[PDB]
Each structure stands twice: as structure tokens, then as C-alpha cells.
């Protein structure tokens, strides 16, 4: 079935934080990618076996993370990149406020 826009807005109203997330992630997309702690990209070449991770270009192997996002968004991002735009994924805030 479909948990569309309107349905979301209600859950948001109810302030049903977690459940809303659950509907979106665990109950649908939910994908696990790797990022470069340097350039906010999916570049990373995680071999999740011999624990190698690398990221030639920004050249890494040490500063790497793992995040859960909707495969719809992995796609949204790659799609934006293919249009030469860079959606950086950073795991820590720096601009304060």
C-alpha cells in the first residue's frame, strides 16, 4: 500500500517521530552506504571483508563512515551527481547555531 505525503503530515502532527521513520526506512527503502569523512560522497570502495575501505581521489582508508538512508535518496543523490551537482554527506555539524 502507500504511505504518501498526507499520511506523513498526520504522523508529523501526532508527533510520532520514530513510527514515521520506521514507515519510511525499515518498512520500505533502508539502505546502508559508506561515505568519505572528507568529501561528502558515496565514493568509498568498502570491501566489507578484508576490511579495506579506501577512497582514491580524496584518498582515504582511515576517515570513513557508514550511514543508513532511503535507497530512494542514495539514488536521489547519485542522480544529482550525474547532473554534476555535489550533495555532501557530513556526519558532524560545524556551522554551529
Amino acid at each position: 500500500l502507500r504511505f504518501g505525503e498526507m499520511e506523513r503530515d498526520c504522523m508529523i502532527a501526532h508527533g510520532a517521530a520514530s513510527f514515521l521513520k520506521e514507515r519510511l526506512m525499515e518498512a520500505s527503502d533502508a539502505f546502508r552506504v559508506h561515505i568519505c569523512g572528507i568529501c561528502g560522497l558515496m565514493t568509498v570502495i568498502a570491501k566489507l571483508n578484508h576490511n579495506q575501505f579506501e577512497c582514491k581521489g580524496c584518498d582515504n582508508k582511515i576517515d570513513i563512515y557508514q550511514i543508513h538512508i532511503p535507497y530512494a535518496a542514495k539514488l536521489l543523490f547519485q542522480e544529482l551527481m550525474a547532473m554534476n551537482i555535489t550533495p555532501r554527506l557530513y556526519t558532524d555539524r560545524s556551522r554551529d547555531f
Binding site: G37, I38, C39, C58, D59, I62, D63, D92, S94
Partner: protein, 178 residues
């Protein structure tokens, strides 16, 4: 899950300037003379010269075996065996590194008294010298200001040869026996 370090360097993309590591007293950014304490304060780098290290380890490795029993209710070749024990009791045992750091540390050490190592430090800290030298001087036997200023090229112009030679003398004087 590795282990970060007290300092959020805003790595804004361009990660290209990884300087070299030489006795130009240029150690990784991770070891500037100016690092930060947990409390948030600044603090001089911390350089341990052999033996002085052997004590810092042994001392914590000991006060560990102790707090490991508070909750348990609910001479050269001689110290080799004595420490092996302190290991198979408060170590991971599979830390083949510490075994080796303790034999090495306990073999090439240059002092046996927390008194001696204390005087050694009192003395050397009056030079205003950098901690990495202040360490190298304590763990490396030196007879000439040349043997010194040569194996520790970061010195060279930071102290007259006579000066550094006096200090060197006092070192062989304090240098515990066997």
C-alpha cells in the same frame, strides 16, 4: 570505531599538505608542542624517554591489578620474570606488543629509581629544549656533544657544546648501575 583525538580540524575537502616527518621537530599534526588536555586546557606534548616509560607503564599496570581486586571480592633478569607476571594478570595477554615493549623497555632502560628518573627530568627540563629532544637525551647514551648534536640534529644551535657536555656528564653520573 577507531579512536578520535581531542581536536576537530575542519577538513574542508582539500586534504593535501601532509608534511613530512623528520627530526626537524616536525611531527604529525597529532604531536605539535601544543596539544589539548581532556579538561579542555592546553598542555605541553608528553615525551617519555625509555625507562621513564617503563615506570609509567609498570605503575599503571600495577595500580590496575589493585582496582582489579577491589571488585574481585564481589634486578635486570629478575624484573623480566616479575613483570611477565604483572602481565598475565592485568594485560590482554594477546597484547604481544606490550610484552615486547616491556622487555625492550626493561632491557634498554637507563634508571631504576623513580627518584633517579625524577632528577634526570628535573635537570633536562631546565634547557627549554623541545620534549622530543628532552626524551632522546634521556634514553640515548652520549659522550660527546658531537655524538649528541649528531644523533639529535634538532639540537645543533639550541645549546653550546660545553653546556650540553656538562649535562651529558651528570647523566652518566646518575645513570644507575646493574
Amino acid at each position: 570505531v577507531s579512536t578520535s583525538t581531542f581536536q576537530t580540524r575542519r577538513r574542508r575537502l582539500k586534504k593535501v599538505e601532509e608534511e613530512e616527518n623528520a627530526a626537524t621537530l616536525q611531527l604529525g599534526q597529532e604531536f605539535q608542542l601544543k596539544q589539548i588536555n581532556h579538561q579542555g586546557e592546553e598542555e605541553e606534548l608528553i615525551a617519555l624517554n625509555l625507562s621513564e616509560a617503563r615506570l609509567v607503564i609498570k605503575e599503571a599496570l600495577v595500580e590496575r591489578r589493585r582496582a582489579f581486586k577491589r571488585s574481585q571480592k564481589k634486578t635486570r633478569e629478575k624484573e623480566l620474570e616479575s613483570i611477565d607476571v604483572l602481565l598475565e594478570q592485568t594485560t590482554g595477554g594477546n597484547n604481544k606488543d606490550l610484552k615486547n615493549t616491556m622487555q625492550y623497555l626493561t632491557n634498554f632502560s637507563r634508571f631504576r629509581d623513580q627518584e633517579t628518573v625524577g632528577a634526570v627530568i628535573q635537570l633536562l627540563k631546565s634547557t627549554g629544549l623541545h620534549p622530543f629532544e628532552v626524551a632522546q637525551l634521556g634514553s640515548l647514551a652520549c659522550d660527546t656533544a658531537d655524538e649528541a648534536k649528531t644523533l639529535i640534529p634538532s639540537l645543533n644551535n639550541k645549546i653550546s657544546d660545553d653546556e650540553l657536555e656538562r649535562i651529558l656528564k651528570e647523566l652518566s653520573n646518575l645513570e644507575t648501575l646493574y
